[PDB]
């Protein structure tokens, strides 16, 4: 699944789709590879607590507008599920 | 509000962060850098979900002062991290 990833400035990072998930990156590159390895690190925490792990991935241009994301960097981390 | 962290080195040559006041989001990297951002991030996350959950996130913070003596922290090499509560 690919999961749009707002990159705001060190880079801070915000999972639209996944609530509560963040990461950052001294670059945008680091915070790209960092934000989708805290995905999987949560879908795995997700599986070993015995949980459902179902997402939907937002498009870009459903969130591109949100007050909240002025100014985002948007990137795309593909995660397996 | 500024969090003391205490910063430790493990073995392996990582370094790990321990948080007074929010024992549970203690954290550790590669580098010190590494190390740090990764608590502070971790911070930032630990008071916006209690945000988000309805509860109160702003009280008192321990301070390097108060906790500098103590036996348990000897060896402690200290950091504070600023967070907006």
Redesign the interface.
Known sequence: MEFPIAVHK?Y?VTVPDI??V???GETIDDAIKNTREAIVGHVETLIELGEDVEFTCSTVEELVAKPEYAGAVWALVSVDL
């Open positions: 060190v801070g609530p509560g963040h990461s950052w």
